[PDB]
Subunit: 334 residues, 4 copies
């Protein structure tokens, strides 16, 4: 159905490709990337975190062959030159990480794509959608360059929505206990961020996150209510959001969990999940939802301050999200 194009075949583009595999409504017809297809097929087939792909993968000249379908692999430095229109690609997933400003991402529209999905926080985008939270606010007439926000923001937004609507958030702080990402260094090497310059798998690393400020793009009533940071730790995947919120109503742990459980089971089914089991981060590896409440961690003090901890597979969850956004957009007409 919707013919999709992926710019950048790094971790996110490959994870999106793996997510799309599972979808009959979306069809990845071409990727753009300067790495040789041999490398790229090796990387698609074998993953240290996600394991071997469940599909036969091979290389034909410069293209990829995944279960008999040949994937055109372009190798343009210029988005402008991708000719998405010529191969009937409607939607472009912009994952290089170099085209996050609207003017750079609109080059894919110039080349014929009809919509661009920036898989990361952007500048000047038409709209930032956090699926489950504000997809209803997408206007096909007016929104062509769309942001799917960050992994952290997709985790937080669903449950800040529930808490906010159900009890009202006065203010709140988050900390994300996150796995190392390809942004960090293996051993101490120069980095913009002096924290992130330190051997990644050796320390607990205080760092920044715009996740808390970005929840405002999807829930405007939370504008100026949240703040938070990050702690990168020696795990390669799965991270957790820890939110301390000062509520307007007086609650109990049970009320809170009960409201969280209802949204997961109803309105947010498939996005927000709820768990009453005592699991650890390796158990959420491969998870596709954007946030799972760790129900036994919910805690309340003086009936107004609540602590809510939620799990996210930061590579799978987010990737499933891009494919759903892709699908959602197309349903609104292209």
């Amino acid at each position: 159905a919707v013919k999709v194009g992926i710019n950048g075949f790094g971790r996110i583009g490959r994870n999106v490709f793996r997510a799309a595999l599972k979808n009959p409504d979306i069809e990845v017809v071409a990727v753009n990337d300067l790495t040789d297809a041999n490398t790229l097929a090796h990387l698609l087939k074998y993953d240290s975190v996600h394991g071997r792909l469940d599909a036969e993968v091979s290389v034909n000249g410069n293209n990829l062959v995944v279960n008999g379908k040949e994937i055109i692999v372009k190798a343009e430095r210029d988005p402008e030159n991708l000719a998405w229109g010529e191969i009937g690609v409607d939607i472009v997933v912009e994952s290089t990480g170099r085209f996050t400003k609207r003017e750079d991402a609109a080059k894919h529209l110039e080349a014929g794509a009809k919509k661009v999905i920036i898989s990361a926080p952007a500048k000047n985008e038409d709209i930032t959608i956090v699926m489950g939270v504000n997809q209803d606010k997408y206007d096909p007439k007016a929104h062509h360059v769309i942001s799917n926000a960050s992994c952290t923001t997709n985790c937080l937004a669903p449950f800040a929505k529930v808490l906010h609507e159900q009890f009202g958030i006065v203010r709140g702080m988050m900390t994300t206990v996150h796995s190392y990402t390809n942004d960090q260094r293996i051993l101490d090497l120069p980095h913009k961020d002096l924290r992130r310059a330190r051997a990644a798998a050796e320390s607990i690393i205080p760092t920044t996150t715009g996740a808390a400020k970005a929840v405002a793009l999807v829930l405007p009533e939370l504008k100026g209510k949240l703040n938070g940071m990050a702690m990168r730790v020696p795990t390669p995947n799965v991270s957790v959001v820890d939110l301390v919120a000062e509520l307007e109503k007086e609650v109990t742990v049970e009320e809170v969990n009960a409201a969280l459980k209802a949204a997961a089971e109803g309105e947010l089914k498939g996005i927000l999940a709820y768990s009453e089991e005592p699991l650890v981060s390796r158990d959420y590896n491969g998870s596709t939802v954007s946030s799972t409440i760790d129900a036994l961690s919910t805690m309340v003090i003086d009936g107004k301050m609540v602590k809510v901890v939620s799990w996210y597979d930061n590579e799978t969850g987010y990737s499933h999200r891009v494919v759903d956004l892709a699908a959602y957009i197309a349903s609104k007409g292209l």
Copy 2:
């Protein structure tokens, strides 16, 4: 000068021992442990987190010779039999982890020690002390079985005092991103806590902590105002407390860090440290203070909610503290 005996020469016992070499007022004359002296001396000399003890260590019979000082190695299963008194031991550091109830810990006093310092949160102790917070409260005449609380309570208590005294805490919530300890399992193996049963070096494992509620023992005024949880991560030593608190006065980040810096430099000097550098966990391994403020992480929202981040080497800091209390108690009279 004060003669000390240690019950249990595991990590805390070896750690206390290491710290004591540096305090000229203390003099460790005996340790009690079931392990053969060869292994204990191998373990004292060589440590994976702390490196090689700087001291000649040998075995003379069933004893250890550390810097040419004979250390009696008893191997008694019951505290009633240590007969501290024959050897002249005044203070006993109870670090087995087994005799934390008054009932067990008081047996050493029966055996002849003048005082007992339980190197863990205790039950029915005479008093629980956090050096820098309430050592003032110690009564030599009535307090004989003293608790040194935990590593995490020694971390939070000192900076909760400042916050509370400057701007007053309404309610707060903490999370400690903590290094794995010997209480966890290597591979999935049985355990009372199904969280702690999982491969410790492979995950992010939420677990409970009593460190928040235990602040109320040392700062009575914070009774029912703090709560928290822990997350053990794949690091061998060094932890971080993340406090989110609702203050009474509207404040600034600058005002919050100047109160803490002032404290660190004045009254709490040696206990509380203040850092304005972008350091990481490995940088604090070997740090002897109880709490180091990660000044670059202070945050406020709405002038009332603050986020404070404090570093601590859960094994080195706590140890120094134990020796500090020993030296402090002895200074009041035996």
Copy 3:
């Protein structure tokens, strides 16, 4: 069809169980273990290495219920008392690690079993079998207490076979670069091996291995010909055998790889595997074969000294082997 009883439900009991689930011809009717059924259902369901078991697991009083079937759980400290005979269990997988001496292991026979498989090296067993190497030497009339050797011996044996057979081994030395085990310590702690007393996820640990010398039990001709050690490294599963051997014949890499490859596709299929891809340890997690030749690592010197590197998932391969042997043994007459 063949009813199996499992003595001990730790990692090997649990993996053997998980392995058995995939053979309709084996049926685990009962396990014997002192941990609570709540703790065992939990540990059966979630593994940090092996992931979630795809099977409905619940507790039914004192028993487990897995996929429809109800597994009786026993909690006998004494095998004498197991009454294998009355529940109709024919083969007992003895995997406690406490009854490796024929005499102890034989207690399962007194209680009703027909055969015993010791999942580890044994003392005075009737026979020690490496499936693919000597199951043909198994005698249903004379062999009742069987050993399945160790994980490492199952890796080495199959290709030492082939190498010896084709070219002839004069002398050889192995090193196994092995994953940490439940036998090591999280943090420096007393252990009989002073090397295994050190923090397992922090160092490269030289240690001993019986593996090399135990090949002689399956290939008598290599008696006195091989030797080796182990190095435990900071990974939780998957290991690698490195063999440097002096051959009697002049050979080339192509010669040795082709032989290795012929046996894997022929006689040793499903036990020995061959790979010309540049994979890493993680890619072998989940692997059921006993040994996978890393073909790109075969190396020759003076036509006579070869280096062969072979992979093994030391938890899964080994578990599939115990399952296969139970089925081989049943098949020869019970």
Copy 4:
């Protein structure tokens, strides 16, 4: 006293700098790097593997201040323009790994330096020296561009020399169980070697090494006799060489170890060390010798085939060697 300048201030230039501090005959007066002075000063101060520099470090505009001495920091892309001459730099440590061919590295002779030490295997160099094995072969007249080889060659060479000299090596094969390096990827990312594209802290990764053949440069009589490979494992520093060799003489475990211990104590004192303690990789972090024989692992089969296991701090020992080499060259005249 001798004035050295470093080209490239990465881990090796910084490790050489730290080592230099101790050497009183050497004096680094300038470093060349494109990284700002701020990051550089941060990275020299704190190290995730070596700890905090015992030196006061600061920034004086674009330069570094280390214990009062202002170190000039140039930032030229091309060695010819470094004007070593005007600042009086006689020796240049070429640690970028970009100017390994003679012709490139000789560009520093053009900017005024008298000698260049390439801290890596080189191509067409005047001489490759392994300190303690062939430094006697150095000619001040004939040799201007010199290679210090690799960390791995520096570990093998000193003990292969001994074994051969004493027993005569017929053929041999090595495995280096190595720490990850800055050359590997944190998560699966493109790389020329598909083994090294794989998340480094998650696996055992086989890869090549030239250290084995590299030894003939230093011991020509072993030309064509050694070959070997590498296994990159999840540790940040400290590695071990595993040598299996076929000797010419019949030997005993005991004669092998005495020869090495004899080497260790006289001739090779400071290069080769000998250990009879059951230590682990962590115990060697900071070791400045090149090779440390793990006496407890020596093994013999048929009086002829032997196993020798040597420890090397791959960043510390190698650095001290460069410093040692810089001081030796200089002692012969400049």
